[PDB]
């Protein structure tokens, strides 16, 4: 039906139909009389995956023959979402499959909804890994994603009595058609034990062994016939493990627990032994695999010419001492040469500045679990600090600040310090973030080795985040400027010459309206909740965190409610305020914020005076597949973190690409977004980084704001008095207390400017034509935020490889 | 190459070749350059399984349309072995696949060796279930096998320093191509909780729930296009299970442990809670599935006309109170009617008379785990004992003997008593065993309800146990009498008219020689052990148990060694004595017996005076796939259990069919084997049941035998003094002590007769022509021992259904 979804030729549709029937029969052992809807999904998934095979084998054969430099992206998170539609899109199969299934009497969109998300990540960091894999394949790089195949991904969120409940995400229950087990590459990983010193160096002995079994998932590039691999490791006990008899077999579970579940913390460090074991497990298995592939090309001088390892935050930081261990203990290279190889191979990306998120492992844990690695880390530290001492003679405080080892109650290893010392490149993920790294938290390191520090502003893939989720918008763009922009997003600048085009303006507004209608329909069918589709869709979706300031949004919502109640018969622009996102299960304040949101909704949504002028909805179970539905439907993107706290954000870029305007602080990539679009076309408010710093020097006093702003005082009194929780008057006492006496994120300080800025949003929305023209200016300048641009920069400035848009033969 | 392996037509071979290449490419994602041998096995398995699909769907559709009476065979064990060759044999695909793989440059027999045994059983009882499924499919019955899909089957046995070591049988590690998950039939199973009494009867509340997910495995009949189902349940936690967060997810393992591992006890009862949970799990899930299928045909009067449930020993005995529970508590039938339905539906097969093997569950366990079932069992007991009291007024001791509840230190429930009371038929598994049940252990029950007691002599499938494992013998038989005997084994009687046929005699002896050569070769390649293929192959393979008297065999072996040493230059018929079998991990005496066997081998096999006249070999890891190799190679089958202890035996029947002669006591099915072949054609020795009874009345004094038999005294002195363990002189003190003072199985009592009988064996073996003629007389009369005969008898005399040899359409 629509052009960007590909051709639906006679021969193709016929073939798809027969292969679908073949799989239903031979693979699923069903006929049409007894086939379940899930059977039909699986038949379609097998039919589509068949099309990957030839390209996958020949891509990997090609790398073996050409022997390019290989890129290894190490991450504990890959937030992939669903695979079916993505695969169809990248193979140009979508229209053909839609036709074939239609002719079989099936609705493809209904079948798509059956697939489980591969929810192997928490939020931004994990989703970035996923967009990166898509871009690396699209740019023809010989790239591999390596991680853990968690049996349970991020929990499913249920809301019960306004409270978050967690349920296990048993995503593999029905089987995963998009993976292929690779038993011949099963590898041993070592834990515990002790170190012996012989005549011929150190030996790590008496270890416990856990096996690492790989599963491969294909990563197709966009219409270039490249299919790269994401290899995820699963933990398996050896067969003689613990080998009364019954108990020994049941105890195999202990070893296999390593790959059982994803830790559900976003921007928070929990120093648990199981997490440390996960981090080593992925590193040890991955490095053996890398070395195997390198030898199957003695001379490790060429190792950095053939291998790049990208560390996604510090989670896989043990790659640095593990590589040293292998090179020194097993290959018998001298220290200095091994170190040279290591530094030239490894690069490190930082994703946060919050002190509580930084990984600082107790020495006693590393001592027991990884005794040889601790020794290696101590040696790295001594040689590094000797360099600092020679560079800054007499600066004893610099020495303690820069040390990999932190003294105190318990000695800890600072993993960020380890990564900087052992990497040739260190990058932040937006210009303001990278500057903050050089000026503040890694200032000492920047002074020692300025050349190591880079910026790589984040991006999102326009395949998933435009073509897939918003085909209507993709189509009206392609009608004017062709299809080339899908892999060259800068071409969207051409849309600037349509800002006065009356046909285009109408088409942009119509696509948004259809998306909103579709999402309003989704909300009634799946959740029995009724919303006005003519209202402004005001959306804040992201993990729940104090720094992201969902609370500031709550204050605005209560302000609007109070104003309506004060002057019931005055016109206001109708809004549907939607907030969604998961809270880490142990994060009490985040759980209270969810309850507050639902409690506000309970009052607002049932007030007869309000009517359909204001609705507050909590979007349950926010995840990639939900993002694909809500983002195209949004009018207003809330990006309101305290300046200096959101390293980049990527949700922000998704909204920009899909025709929502942004209300935001000058934080993370918001700064660069405003720069690209023009500040006139962005709703900027609030303190800048410099203003926050000034307030900190003076001391933040929340009482001052409470005393001088009557509208704010009223809200606080309502919260305290039990207006939003009649049967439990003091329910929100923790929230009020934090706001008044221990708010690290200065919610009150940005309140007045935020409310005023929100008034300007409502004003623009009253003029549909001018709203849409500003939207066009945003979409047209969103090109910089393609992860294709981001990856091309990593390739050229860090990995030392050239991207290629050229097709491999079919 | 050989006729019984089927046609290898041009069109078939071409098709197989292309489907093999298709699976290698699309399914395994490999080409010929990188394909591993395991890849080739999987390609072949997928190619063969494709041929099952149409027949499987249409068989099950046929049952749905015709609505015959369904047979449900409930077992905690199904000892299936490998599936690939069996499937080819039953589909007439063997020659075609052999040709196709040969043309691809592959050896099919090498590929076959890659498949893991499905080792979901311990020995005889589990293997019987497997032969039964094959026969029920071959006889066109609407039959279903129901059991547990254990993650770990019977352990792999390694011998280290002459001792058994156990290793986990991780049989699913690489994936099982012969199963199909059926997620839509996932069912809840309840545990713990408590009973509430309302106005409307009892209610079982506050339970913990575990999910039962079924996996289906096809069971093809022999060339009749019937494919029946074996449905095995796997345990899964519900998603809100235990739902700090991380621990709750890790604790899901506790629920899923139910299906983790097979209990490795053969003929021994271990009263463990995990085992009880396994027994209920299979029963509860199976009964819901049965009822679902029955309703999809309100009136339960017809239930026994449409359903038969066969209980394989008492392991699934909870089916009786579970059926009552469903009918009374859920369907609201009155007690008496529910009971009528239950009795008419259920039948019970007993497989042992050893008191330590009988299931007697502590009441306190049932009280906690299954409180409603305990109540139901008490009610059954009261109503049953009221019938006993009316039938035998004043016989108070009969009342305590017959009670389902046993008083004592801990009160227990006798599950055998439950099964008799709640079943319309009770059978033993050989004529002598069934008679012993009526005369001794169930005498009281037989007097009350004589009509319930039956015999069903065991059998083995001639597909696996002749055509598959011994194609050479199958072929020389088919050359003379055609192919019909494979599903009508009584036709082997026709071979009696060839007992004087010089061509046939030569052919029978040649096939044995080739089998022995092949097995001698297997032993050198896989185990680096050297054996003389001209020797008599003297084989005892079965689980290690005191009752099976591997020890008596050991005594004979030492006798032969001592005689050679006494007169080195006298001629003796050379022998290779092979003993194999697993010991239950907690069974100390059985472990000592294995060590003794290996210790004897250590002395005998390295004595220069002995030469290659005597060799003693322990066959490591005896299992179905090993039985398929060794049984065709055997000359002499050792079946030497103390009279009255082996209920039937089935290994005995396998040896008879494959051209070995039998040395045996008049125990289990040995009696009926001798009756069929003629006692002249069998090597019978030792006490009869009546002789054992006489010895028991008098008191068994082992010292008497020791005092009167000089050759026996010498062996005992050698064992005691450390002749067989120089560095640990007292190693075998436990063994000597047991033999001398607490031998329940009267090893010494049968020693003289056994040795004398073994001399007669050696004498016959010196005359190759007469040895072979006696073999022919055994093979020719082995027909009764087909499990087709056994199943036809269950069908007609217990289940009330007619078998059918008629083909379904292809
Ligand atoms: O069907 C469920 C099972 O599938 C198996 N995949 C097999 S056999 N081929 N895949 C081939 C393949 C081929 C192309 C693309 C692709 O993504 C996969 C996986 O190894 C199992 O872990 C999984 O449970
Ligand atoms: O490939 C490995 C996987 O195979 C799957 N089988 C599927 S998709 N079709 N089978 C179809 C089938 C078809 C005919 C006969 C037969 O015996 C099976 C099983 O459900 C998995 O548990 C297993 O891990
Ligand atoms: O760059 C991609 C995104 O990365 C995010 N970091 C995340 S999700 N975890 N970080 C750190 C972390 C995660 C888990 C444990 C821990 O100790 C630390 C940033 O907050 C975003 O601004 C950014 O857009
Ligand atoms: O009929 C088939 C075969 O059955 C065997 N029984 C076996 S393996 N377990 N029995 C009982 C058992 C098994 C496990 C636990 C338990 O408490 C009892 C008999 O010993 C054989 O003679 C017979 O040929």
Which residues of A are catalytically annotated? 351, 542-543, 548, 650, 654
| DSSP structure class, residue A407 | P
Task: Decide if B254 touches A, using CB distance below 8 A.
Answer: no
* Torsion angles phi and psi, residue B580, rounded to 5: -150, 160
Chain B residues close to A253, C-beta within 8 Å: 253
* Same structural domain, A623 and A714: yes
Tokens of B473: 């013998």
Q: In whole angstroms, what is the distance from residue B38 CA to residue B24 CA? A: 11
Put simply, the answer to whether B38 touches A272 (Cβ < 8 Å) is no
Per DSSP (E only), the strands in B44-97 are 70-74, 78-81
CB pairs under 8 A between A and B: 103
What is d(CA A663, CA A640) in angstroms, rounded to the nearest whole number? 7
On whether both B363 and B469 belong to a single domain, the answer is no
> Which atom in ligand 4 lies closest to the alpha carbon of residue B349?
1
- Please report the residues numbered 13 through 32 in chain B whose beta carbons come closer than 8 angstroms to any beta carbon of chain A: 25-26, 29-31
What span, in angstroms and rounded, lies between the C-alpha atoms of A734 and A70? 51
d(CA A310, CA B591): 54
* DSSP secondary structure letters along B347-367: EEE-----GGGS-EEEHHHHH
Separation CA A100–CA A88 (nearest Å): 13
Residues 6+ apart with CB under 8 A from A794: A310, A456
- Do the bridges between strand A636-639 and strand A661-664 make them parallel or antiparallel, or are there none, so unpaired? parallel
Q: Is A236 at the interface with chain B, CB within 8 A? A: yes
Instruction: Count Cα atoms within 13 angstroms, Cβ side, for A133.
Output: 30
Residue B752 phi, psi dihedral angles, 5° rounding: -60, -50
Alpha carbon of A386 to ligand 4 centroid (Å): 74
- Backbone break loci in chain A, preceding residues, C–N > 2.5 A: 243, 297
CB contact under 8 A, B29 and A183: no
Q: CA of B275: which chain A residue's CA is closest? A: A246
Q: Which atom of ligand 3 is nearest to the CA of A358?
A: 17
Q: How many of the other CB atoms lie within 10 Å of CB of A733?
A: 14
- Ligand nearest the Cα of residue B653 is 4
For B306, the 3-state DSSP assignment is helix
Residue B465 DSSP one-character state: I
Domain shared by B177 and B275, yes or no: yes
Displacement of CA B54 from its chain's centroid (Å): 30
Q: How far is the CA of B179 from the centre of ligand 2 (A)?
A: 5
Pick from B34, B241, B246, B271 the residue to mutate for testing the A interface (most A CBs within 10 Å). B246
Helix B124-138, helix B787-794: angle, nearest 10: 80
Q: Are residues A235 and A256 in contact, defined by beta-carbon separation less than 8 angstroms?
A: yes
Residue B464 has a CB neighbour count (10 Å cut-off) of: 25
Are the C-beta atoms of A786 and A690 separated by less than 8 Å? Answer: no
Domain that holds residue B355: 1-459+787-810
A254 touches chain B (CB under 8 A): no
Residues A43 and A106 in one domain: yes
How many other CB atoms sit within 10 Å of the CB of residue B527? 11
How far does A535 lie from chain B, in Å, by closest CA?
A: 37
DSSP bridge pairs for A63: none
Beta bridge partners of A454: A427
Instruction: Give the binding-site residues of ligand 2, using a 6 Å CB cut-off.
Output: A 27, 29; B 49, 52-53, 175-181, 218
CA distances A567 to A536, A558, A684, A762, Å, are 20, 14, 28, 17
CA distance A168 to chain B (A): 5
**CA A464 to chain CA mean position, Å:** 13
What values do phi and psi take at B682, rounded to 5? -135, 145
Q: Which atom of ligand 2 is nearest to the CA of B180?
A: 20
Domain match, B44 and B180 both = yes
- 3-state SS, A85-133, equals HHHHHHHCCHHHHHHHHHHCCCCHHHHHCCCCCEEECCCHHHHHHHHHH
List, in sequence order, the alpha helices (H) in A605-732. Answer: 624-630, 651-657, 670-677, 689-698, 702-708, 710-721
d(C-alpha B177, C-alpha B174), whole Å? 9
Angle, nearest 10°, between helix axes A371-391 and A335-345? 90
Q: Which residues contact B73 (CB under 8 A, 6 or more apart)?
A: B129, B132, B133, B136, B143, B144, B145, B146, B310, B312
Q: Whose CA is nearest to atom 11 of ligand 1?
A: B27
Question: Are B468 and B420 contained in the same domain?
Answer: no
Q: Which chain B residues contact residue A236 at CB under 8 A? A: 170, 173
Q: How far apart are CA B54 and CA B41, in angstroms?
A: 22
Instruction: Give the span between the Cα atoms of A471 and A511, in whole angstroms.
Output: 9
Question: Residues B696, B699, B705, CA angle at the centre, nearest 5°?
Answer: 105
PDB experimental method: X-ray
For B586, the closest of A155, A244, A257 (CB atoms) is A244
- Residues β-bridged to residue B414: B360
User: How many whole angstroms separate alpha carbon B159 and alpha carbon B720?
Assistant: 24
Contacts of A240 in chain B (CB under 8 A): 167-168
The closest of B715, B768, B776, B769 to B740, measured between CA atoms, is B715
User: B405-406 and B412-414: which strand pairing?
Assistant: antiparallel
Any idea what DSSP says for residue B375? H
Tokens representing A408 are: 């105190």
Please give the full DSSP string across B264-299, using - where no structure is assigned.
--SS-----HHHHHHHHHHHHHHHHHHHHHHHT---
- Residues A680, A721, single domain; the answer is yes
Q: Examine the domain organization and report whether A563 and A585 are in the same domain.
A: yes
- The three-class DSSP label of residue A625 is helix
Closest-CA residue of chain A to B22: A50
Rounded Cα distance, B473 and B455, in Å: 31
Binding residues of A for AMP: 31, 64, 292-297
Whole-angstrom distance, CA of residue B643 vs CA of residue B668? 8
**Any B CB within 8 A of A247 CB:** no
Q: Is the dihedral of CA A389, A392, A397, A399 positive or negative?
A: negative
Tally the domains of chain A: 2
* Under 8 Å between Cβ of A72 and A290: yes
Catalogue the long-range contacts made by A739-746 (C-beta closer than 8 Å, 24 or more residues apart): A739/A551, A739/A702, A740/A702, A740/A703, A740/A706, A740/A716, A741/A702, A743/A700, A743/A702, A744/A546, A744/A547, A745/A546, A745/A547, A745/A549, A745/A642, A745/A645, A746/A642, A746/A687, A746/A692, A746/A695, A746/A700
Q: Is A50 on the interface with B (CB under 8 A)?
A: yes
CA dist B375 → A537, B150, B230, B371 (Å) = 60, 30, 32, 7
Q: Which residues pair with A663 in a beta bridge?
A: A638, A683
Angstrom distance (rounded) from CA A656 to CA A679:
14
Same domain, B793 and B778: no
Report the candidate in A138, A780, A143, A758 with the shortest Cα–Cα distance to residue A493: A780
Size of chain B, expressed as the number of residues it contains: 810
Q: Does B59 contact A at CB distance below 8 Å?
A: no
Give the binding-site residues of ligand 3, using a 6 Å CB cut-off: A 122-125, 128, 265-269, 313, 351-352, 357, 359, 429, 458, 646-650, 668
DSSP state of B441: I
Q: What's the rounded Cα separation, in Å, for the pair B267 and B89?
A: 33
CA distance B191 to B317: 17
CB contact under 8 A, B585 and A260: no
C-alpha distance across the termini of chain A, in Å: 25
**Minimal CA separation from A804 to chain B, in Å:** 26
Is there a contact between A125 and A498 (Cβ–Cβ < 8 Å)? no
Strands ordered across the beta sheet of A412-414: A360-362, A412-414, A405-406
How remote is the CA of residue B352 from the centroid of ligand 4, in Å?
Answer: 6
Which chain A residue shows the shortest CA-CA distance from B37? A184
Burial of B588 from C-beta contacts in 10 A (0-12 / 13-18 / 19+): exposed
**How large is the greatest C-alpha to C-alpha distance in chain A, in angstroms?**
90
In chain B, which residues are last before a break of more than 2.5 Å from C to the next N?
243, 297
Cα dihedral sign, A696-A698-A700-A705: negative
Cβ-contact B58, B808 below 8 angstroms: yes
Smallest-distance ligand from the CA of B172: 2
Q: List residues bridging with A261 in a β-sheet.
A: A152
Neighbouring C-beta atoms of residue A213, cutoff 10 Å: 21
Say how far apart CA B633 and CA B626 lie, in whole Å.
Answer: 11
Query: Candidates B177, B217, B229: which one to mutate for ligand 2, based on the most atoms within 8 Å of Cβ?
Result: B177
Minimum CA–CA partner of B259 in chain A = A250
Same domain for B69 and B187: yes
Joined tokens for residue B178: 């012969």
Task: For strands B307-312 and B360-362, give the pairing.
Answer: unpaired
CA A669 vs CA A212, A314, A685, B783: distances in Å = 38, 22, 15, 83
**B352 and B501: one domain?**
no
Burial code (b: 16+ CB inside 10 Å, e: under 16) for B219-233 equals: bbbbbbbbbbbbbbb
CB interface of A with B, residues 266-295, below 8 Å: 272, 274
CA distance A206 to A315: 26
Tell me how far apart the alpha carbons of residues A369 and A208 are, in angstroms, rounded to a whole number: 10
For residue B649, give the ligand 4 atom closest to its CA.
24
Q: Are A9 and A95 in contact (CB under 8 A)?
A: no
Closest to A572 in 3D by CA, of A582, A585, A559: A559
Rounded to the nearest 5°, which phi and psi values hold at B453?
Answer: -90, 125
Bin A678: left if φ > 0, else alpha if -120 < ψ < 50, else beta. left
DSSP tag of A258:
G
Active site residues of B: 351, 542-543, 548, 650, 654
Question: Measured between alpha carbons, how far is B710 from A628 in angstroms, rounded to an integer?
Answer: 90
Chain B residue with CA closest to A185: the answer is B36
Q: For residue A24, what is the DSSP state?
A: I
Cα of A155 to nearest chain B Cα, Å: 9
A563: Cβ–Cβ under 8 A, 6 or more apart, which residues?
A572
**Which ligand does the CA of B26 lie closest to?**
1
CB A280 within 8 A of CB A320: no
B156 near A CB under 8 A: yes
The Cα B198–Cα B196 span in angstroms is: 6
Looking at residue B409, the DSSP 8-state letter turns out to be: S
| B18, B21, B26, B169, best to mutate vs chain A, most A CBs in 10 Å | B26
Q: Is the separation of the CB atoms in B671 and B665 below 8 Å?
A: no
Q: Residues B93, B51: contact at Cβ < 8 Å? A: yes
- Closest C-alpha among B429, B436, B168, B151 to residue B310: B429
| Contact present, B119 and B624 (Cβ < 8 Å) | yes
- Same domain membership, residue B465 and residue B365: no
Out of B166, B246, B272, whose CB is closest to A243?
B166
In angstroms, rounded to a whole number, what is the distance separating the alpha carbons of residues B279 and B370?
12
- Tokens 């009498």 belong to residue: B481
Residue B214: φ, ψ to 5°: -85, 145
Helix then strand then coil, % of chain A, to nearest 5: 55, 15, 30
CA distances from B25 to A183, A214, A808, B19, B49 (A): 17, 19, 19, 10, 17
Nearest-angstrom CA–CA distance, A337 and A351: 30
User: Got the DSSP string for A468-512?
Assistant: IT-HHHHHHHHHHH-SGGGG-GGGGGGGGGGTT-HHHHHHHHHHH
What is the Cα–Cα distance from B317 to B348, expressed in whole angstroms? Answer: 9
Q: Residue B753 belongs to a domain with what CATH number?
A: 3.40.50.2000
> Is residue B232 classed as helix, strand or coil in its secondary structure?
strand
Side-chain half-sphere of B214: how many Cα atoms within 13 Å? 23
Tell me how far apart the alpha carbons of residues B509 and A423 are, in angstroms, rounded to a whole number. Answer: 75
What is the chain A residue with the closest CA to B216? A29
Q: Evaluate whether B304 touches B341 at the Cβ level (below 8 Å).
A: yes
Helix (H, G, I), strand (E, B) or coil at A717: helix
Total residue length of chain A: 810
């Amino acid at each position: 039906q629509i052009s960007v979804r590909g051709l639906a030729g006679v021969e193709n549709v016929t073939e798809l139909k027969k292969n679908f029937n073949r799989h239903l029969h031979f693979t699923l052992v069903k006929d049409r009389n007894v086939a379940t809807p899930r059977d039909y999904y699986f038949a379609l998934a097998h039919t589509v995956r068949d099309h990957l095979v030839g390209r996958w084998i020949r891509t990997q054969q090609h790398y073996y023959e050409k022997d390019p430099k290989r890129i290894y992206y190490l991450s504990l998170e890959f937030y992939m979402g669903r695979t079916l539609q993505n695969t169809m899109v990248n193979l140009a199969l979508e229209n053909a499959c839609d036709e074939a299934t239609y002719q079989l009497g099936l609705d493809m969109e209904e079948l798509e909804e059956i697939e489980e998300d591969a929810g192997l990540g928490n939020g931004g960091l994990g989703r970035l890994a996923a967009c990166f894999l898509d871009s690396m394949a699209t740019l023809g790089l010989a790239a591999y994603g390596y991680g853990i195949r968690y049996e349970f991904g991020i929990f499913n969120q249920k809301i019960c009595g306004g409270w978050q409940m967690e349920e296990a995400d048993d995503w593999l229950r029905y089987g995963n058609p998009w993976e292929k087990a690779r038993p011949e590459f099963t590898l041993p990983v070592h834990f515990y034990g002790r170190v012996e010193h012989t005549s011929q160096g150190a030996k790590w002995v008496d270890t416990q062994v856990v096996l690492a079994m790989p599963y491969d998932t294909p990563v197709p590039g966009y219409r270039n016939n490249v299919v790269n691999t994401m290899r995820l490791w699963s933990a398996k006990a050896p067969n003689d493990f613990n080998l009364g008899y019954i108990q020994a077999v049941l105890d195999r579970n202990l070893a296999e627990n390593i790959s059982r579940v994803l830790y559900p913390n976003d921007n928070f460090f929990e120093g648990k032994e199981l997490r440390l074991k996960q981090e080593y497990f992925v590193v040890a298995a991955t490095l053996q695999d890398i070395i195997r592939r390198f030898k199957s090309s003695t001379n490790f001088d060429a190792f950095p010419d053939k291998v790049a390892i990208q560390l996604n935050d510090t989670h896989p930081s043990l790659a640095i001492p593990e590589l040293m261990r292998v090179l020194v203990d097993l290959e018998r290279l001298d220290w200095d040469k091994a170190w040279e190889v290591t530094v030239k191979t490894c690069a490190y990306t930082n994703h946060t500045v919050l002190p509580e998120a930084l990984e600082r492992w107790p020495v006693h844990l590393l001592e027991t679990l990884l005794p040889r690695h601790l020794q290696i880390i101590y040696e790295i530290n001594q040689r590094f600090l000797n360099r600092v001492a020679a560079a800054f003679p007499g600066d004893v405080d610099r020495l303690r600040r820069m040390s990999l080892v932190e003294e105190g109650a318990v000695k800890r290893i600072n993993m960020a310090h380890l990564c900087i010392a052992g990497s040739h490149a260190v990058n932040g993920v937006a210009r303001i973030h990278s500057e903050i790294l050089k000026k503040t938290i890694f200032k000492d390191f920047y002074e020692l080795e300025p050349h190591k520090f880079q910026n790589k502003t984040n991006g999102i893939t326009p395949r998933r985040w435009l073509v897939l989720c918003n085909p209507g918008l993709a189509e009206i763009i392609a009608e004017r400027i062709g299809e080339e922009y899908i892999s060259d997003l800068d071409q969207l600048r051409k849309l600037l010459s349509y800002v006065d085009d009356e046909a285009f303006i109408r088409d942009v507004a119509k696509v948004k309206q259809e998306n909103k209608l579709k999402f309003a329909a989704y909300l009634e069918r799946e959740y029995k909740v009724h919303i006005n589709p003519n209202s402004l869709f005001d959306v804040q979706v992201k993990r729940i965190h104090e720094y992201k300031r969902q609370l500031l949004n709550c204050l605005h919502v209560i302000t609007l409610y109070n104003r309506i109640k004060k002057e019931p018969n005055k016109f206001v622009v109708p809004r549907t305020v939607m907030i969604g996102g998961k809270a880490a299960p142990g994060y009490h304040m985040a759980k209270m914020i969810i309850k507050l949101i639902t409690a506000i909704g309970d009052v607002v949504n049932h007030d007869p005076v309000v009517g359909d002028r204001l609705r507050v909805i909590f979007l349950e179970n926010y995840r990639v597949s939900l993002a694909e539905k809500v983002i195209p439907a949004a009018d207003l993107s809330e990006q309101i973190s305290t300046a200096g706290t959101e390293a980049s954000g990527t949700g922000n870029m998704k909204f920009m690409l899909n025709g929502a305007l942004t209300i935001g602080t000058m934080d993370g990539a918001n700064v660069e977004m405003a720069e690209e679009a023009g500040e006139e076309n962005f709703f900027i408010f609030g303190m800048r980084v410099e203003d926050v710093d000034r307030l900190d020097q003076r001391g933040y006093n929340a009482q001052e704001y409470y005393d001088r702003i009557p509208e704010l005082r009223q809200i606080i009194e309502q919260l305290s008095s039990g207006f939003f929780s009649p049967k439990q008057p003091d329910l929100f006492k923790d929230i009020v207390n934090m706001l008044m006496h221990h708010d690290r994120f200065k919610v009150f300080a940005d309140y007045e400017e935020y409310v005023k800025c929100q008034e300007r949003v409502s004003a623009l929305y009253k003029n549909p034509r001018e709203w849409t023209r500003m939207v066009i200016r945003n979409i047209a300048t969103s090109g910089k935020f393609s992860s294709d641009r981001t990856i091309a920069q990593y390739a050229r400035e860090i990995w030392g490889v050239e991207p290629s848009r050229q097709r491999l033969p079919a």
